[PDB]
């Protein structure tokens, strides 16, 4: 079938690919919105092919991906694979920790695949299609096959988007700590890695103050515990944790701790987990299932089990009372780390609801919590971190990935976004510059990061030179005076409007074909327009201003719009931004 | 002599008797689709119209033997009818409730025919089994090793439900139901043909002393709480009461955790000194071992990182398993690294402590996960049980195992699954002869009928703490006539008369039974014949011999008739054709005959030596 709008244009086209209980129910929820409920139910896979269309048609949403484009680009052929929370760090086939079955068109069509579907997603570049599949074979989906979805058609991309988000996604009711929207977060992970210890945390805190930076908080990362699954400090690397936390308090540092859902087989807590039955089980529901993650082999906690939830929460509360820790970084949470076939205390026909149940563990510590997964987690009022970025320039987890990823996550109704580490994680063989991100990549990244809801340093500015430190202090000051006040105001609006903080250009210019295509610019609310340099050896870039009057950061009033500003000057130590007038 | 129809077939012998009948239960044939080319009869279509690879190939391997190869490939089910009351069947699996001949009780949906622990289940199949059924009418069936074979039964129509399926089963693909039905002149000749065709004979013989002197086990006496003091007290008490020993078997638990191989120093302060003392008192010693490593073993981490364990289906991670001693992984005996690793630890215990051999406990695939992967794929999961039994090969002379899956050529002892201190066919005294004969049918000659008096499990013990005095005495007497004899709860736990009865049967075993067991053990390599034989072995045309579950032979010449009922000082004794000299010197030369109310005191067993 195919669908048109009131103006007569074809906005949606779909081919049946399993063959030629089916229904299409038309609904008129508003004078300007037309929705089409669709079902195909016959034991053999259902597949429908959704055509993106004639390249003037641009699409947004779906999953956080390793290679994030905006609008969405289909590369090659992909057989339908489970649309579930996966770790996308090392896979361009899989789908990332934050996703919904939601696709939005610039032609003002949108599709929400029904939550019931055992949903698998593939694609075909040749015919430019999304391959929408329901199946129960070779998949972590369990029965409780049906492909069911709703296609809606509005007047423009922004109105139809707002209708869909208000229909399907819950807004958060609370706001993270104000300081997290202004002062940089400092993380041990990229700087020190696993080898972090009591000396290194204190040296870091000293160096942060010596170079005159504020902190939202200091985040002590992997690894501070004797084994993965233990909750208390390794006394070899942390001789007197209490004294460490006292010193950090004296220097005005709030502190968070890296946590995860795993208990390795050589944790002092593994036996306790087995005997108390706190772990995700093999299919028969009798025994723990072993899992492999990047930090070894063990079990994973069952967050559908009240005993496992209270047990995890108990250890977090103890770290809080013992050390005055503010909150936690909840790492992993993807079901790609659960077994293919598993059982839990409450059955999960949809495995990704496990990811949701993990994100619930942040609720009691939400104010300075971060998670890196979201599956209908929008009403959890903590920060959502993009999956670990690499110290490269490109769309593959690099600098050019930041704006597509942040916008994608914003489309899915998560306002409080943390675009991971300034300069990336500096992984050997995945670092433009060898040991650390090259100076120019670090500077351009820092500048984009200064305009996002939360800013996190690991490799600090003073690792480079005094000019890089000066650039950092400049953008820290600019963030405090211009960006932070707006982020907080927009953060406070979310409860009422459900609108995101970081917005695509097309948000205010929904009928603008150029705004539909832009992946190099973004808005903070409707009034701040940001155009970072995202290419090396460049001291200028083309800047698109949509309809309306815009006052440049230099005081230039642009009142003949829309217009492309060609070779607009932007020095290494500058970012192009424009305020609505 | 085969009669094929749409919905099943039947077979007759040269004399004209129907000796085999089978119904197709996953469909019927289209007979217009059947064509005969010499020996081969092939059919290409079901009655429903489904395409089918079905055939029956007749083979004449000998003047007196006629075989019928059968295949059905499109879940496949055929119902094999046992027939009228006059037709008696033997073989299949060791079972919780063992009858002889085989009795079908109630309705059973086909379930995987795999090595299971039948201690607590009357549905499952035991550690020793083959897909082999033998009829008193001289028909036999061997189900093809290829089949993903599931077995059920139906009492109403008295049928075995033979099923091939790949759904809800530990069988993996590499469904086809394939088998061979053979017909001979008598039950013994057709049995001998089938055993020689399908089962390898062992080429070696266990230590002579194991066929004569009692084995002493710590398990039933002390259980888990066994320690260095208790082993030495036991050894002292064995010598104080003037008994020989094949060996002393130190059982569960002597290690700090399950998966560790060395002695718990809390319970065994100086193991070396313990073994020295046992050597000084002329004790050979064996140690209880198992295929598991619990999660709290000091060897669990080593197993995970070295990938020595049976894995979950994706083949990446160990699969956790539950056994009666806790939760952990199970060693992959298809993996050379896991085999060398296990063998390494056994060799170290040998050189360190001069241990003679090991009791290899568990070994059933009911302790592996439903769905698993191994270093080498096992379409048939029970081959894992076989690979475990191979670990006995280097220590075969005083080794025992309690599983067998084409393990016949491993020249160690095979132990019946743990017996209970009850009288009945449910792992009790009356189970001993059916079980030993069943295991003998499957070509395992060196059989150990577990512990004299059973394992004394609370709530499963006629007598409370220990087996009743009378049950213990009657059991000891029948156990004295089996290939290997094992005490745990010793005679001196009762009274001086029980000790005297033990010394009498120990002496009788040494002078009468042991010389015959050794001679018959030495014959196996040549003849492939078992040691313990059913009455019908020498009397294959004797309808009474076909039915007897209360008597057995040692070879062809020693006939044994124990009392298997409480408060009895007599029993009926059937003597088949030939002359028999009673243990009292009575010549019975008018046979076959039923000896009615034949006197057997509490301290006696009825036995008869061939005199023809
Ligand atoms: C004790 O008894 C065992 C059987 O009860 C003996 O092992 C069996 O021996 C026979 C004859 O050697 C084997 O049958 C053969 O298999 C070989 C090897 O096949 C392998 O490769 C194929 C690849 O196509 C694979 O599918 C198989 O699974 C094997 O990995 C074939 O090449 C021959 O043609 C023939 O079919 C049995 O495989 C084997 N069974 C088991 C369960 O081990 C054992 O040798 C006896 N001991 C002694 C000392 O003789
Ligand atoms: C979306 O999913 C829900 C749940 O699968 C569907 O609602 C069910 O409809 C089935 C049969 O169509 C009924 O048997 C259930 O009782 C319904 N449950 C509820 C909660 O209403 C719904 O129909 C699906 N939408 C479409 C368009 O197929
Ligand atoms: C936060 O949103 C989640 C997800 O929408 C809510 O959980 C769902 O709520 C509905 C309505 O009660 C239930 O029927 C669903 O089963 C829930 N789904 C899951 C995956 O949990 C949750 O209630 C919201 N929180 C609050 C406080 O309203
Ligand atoms: C067990 O065997 C009995 C006897 O053959 C089966 O009962 C008959 O089933 C047939 C086929 O459906 C009916 O036509 C008869 O009327 C049934 N009753 C009789 C003859 O007893 C029974 O189906 C078998 N059950 C199982 C579970 O195999
Ligand atoms: C714990 O186990 C991991 C594998 O899960 C292993 O690599 C590591 O070295 C072990 N470390 C400790 C401290 O036991
Ligand atoms: C640093 O913190 C102080 C105290 O809260 C605040 O007044 C100031 O604006 C901050 N400066 C920054 C972020 O540059
Ligand atoms: C028995 O199995 C083998 C291997 O699958 C097969 O080639 C043979 O034909 C089977 N026998 C019969 C009678 O089907
Ligand atoms: C064990 O006992 C013997 C004799 O008492 C002695 O020679 C040996 O040194 C002892 N060793 C240990 C470690 O107890
Ligand atoms: C014990 O062993 C000796 C010597 O090995 C043997 O001659 C004797 O028959 C055995 N039996 C008894 C009951 O003493």
Author numbering:
A (entry chain D): 100 to 119, 144 to 165, 169 to 270, 277 to 713
B (entry chain A): 92 to 165, 171 to 270, 277 to 714
What do the paper's sentences say?
MYORG is a member of glycoside hydrolase (GH) family 31 (GH31) and, like the other mammalian GH31 enzyme α-glucosidase II, this enzyme is found in the lumen of the endoplasmic reticulum (ER). We were intrigued by MYORG, which is a type II transmembrane protein predicted to be comprised of a short, disordered nucleocytoplasmic N-terminal region, a single transmembrane helix, and a lumenal C-terminal catalytic region comprising a CAZy family glycoside hydrolase 31 (GH31) catalytic domain and 2 β-sheet domains. Here, we demonstrate that MYORG, enigmatically, functions not as an α-glucosidase but rather an α-galactosidase and shows marked preference for specific disaccharide substrates. Recent studies in diverse populations have shown a link between mutations in myogenesis-regulating glycosidase (MYORG) and the development of this disease.
We obtained crystals of unliganded MYORG and processed them in the P1 space group to 2.43 Å. Four copies of MYORG could be placed within the asymmetric unit (chains A to D). For chains A to C, the polypeptide backbone could be confidently traced into the electron density map, with only the first 11 amino acids (80–91) and 2 short loop regions (residues 165–171 and 270–276) proving too disordered to model. Chain C represents the most complete model of MYORG and will be used hereafter to describe the structure of MYORGGH31. Analysis of the crystal structure reveals MYORG is comprised of an antiparallel β-sandwich N-terminal domain (residues 92–287), a (β/α)8-barrel catalytic domain (residues 288–633) with an insertion between α3 and α4 (residues 393–436), and a proximal β-sheet domain (residues 634–714). Five cysteine residues are present in the structure and form 2 disulphide bonds within the N-terminal domain (C125 with C134 and C158 with C284). MYORGGH31 is predicted to have 6 N-glycosylation sites: N240, N250, N346, N372, N398, and N511. Glycosylation is observed on every polypeptide chain in the asymmetric unit, and it is possible to model N-glycans on all of the predicted N-glycosylation sites of chains B and C. The crystal structure shows that MYORG forms a 2-fold dimeric assembly, agreeing with our SEC-MALLS analysis, with the protein–protein interaction exclusively localised to the insert region. The interface covers 639 Å2 and is largely supported through a hydrophobic interaction network composed of F402, V406, L419, L422, and I429, in addition to hydrogen bonding between Y397 to E407.
